[PDB]
């Protein structure tokens, strides 16, 4: 059911900017396994809670 595309959709859904969106998306594209990409996903969570404060 879940996919890598849905994840990309999450980024292009949250109210991010230009720079952080691009930077993160490139970093996300740099995926390979799962535990790694997950840790990077954890960063998305923090990023919003930072941008939003």
Curated annotation (Swiss-Prot):
Cystine residue pairs: none
Subcellular location: Host cytoplasm
Post-translational modification remark: Phosphorylated by PKC/PRKCZ, and other unknown kinases. Phosphorylation is necessary for viral transcription and replication. The N-terminus contains the majority of phosphorylated sites.
Stretch list, region Formation of N-RNA complex involved in transcription and replication: 32-51
Miscellaneous information on this protein: The P/V/C gene has two overlapping open reading frames. One encodes the P/V/W proteins and the other the C/Y proteins.
Family to which this protein belongs: Belongs to the respirovirus P protein family.
The record's note on its domains: The N-terminus consists of a long intrinsically disordered tail. The central part contains the coiled-coil multimerization domain (PMD). Forms a four-stranded coiled coil structure. The C-terminus constitutes the alpha-helical domain that binds to the nucleocapsid (N-RNA complex).
Assembly with partners or alone: Homotetramer. Interacts (via multimerization domain) with polymerase L; this interaction forms the polymerase complex. Interacts (via N-terminus) with N0; this interaction allows P to chaperon N0 before encapsidation and form the N-P complex. Interacts (via C-terminus) with N-RNA template; this interaction positions the polymerase on the template.
Function recorded in the entry: Essential cofactor of the RNA polymerase L that plays a central role in the transcription and replication by forming the polymerase complex with RNA polymerase L and recruiting L to the genomic N-RNA template for RNA synthesis. Also plays a central role in the encapsidation of nascent RNA chains by forming the encapsidation complex with the nucleocapsid protein N (N-P complex). Acts as a chaperone for newly synthesized free N protein, so-called N0, allowing encapsidation of nascent RNA chains during replication.
Full protein name: Phosphoprotein
Species annotation: Sendai virus (strain Harris) (SeV)
Originating gene: P/V/C
Residues of the full protein shown: 516 to 568 of 568
């Amino acid at each position: 059911k879940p996919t890598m595309h849905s994840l990309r959709l999450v980024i292009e859904s949250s109210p991010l900017s230009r720079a952080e969106k691009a930077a993160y998306v490139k970093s996300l594209s740099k995926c390979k396994t799962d535990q790694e990409v997950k840790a990077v996903m954890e960063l998305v969570e923090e990023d919003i809670e930072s941008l939003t404060n």
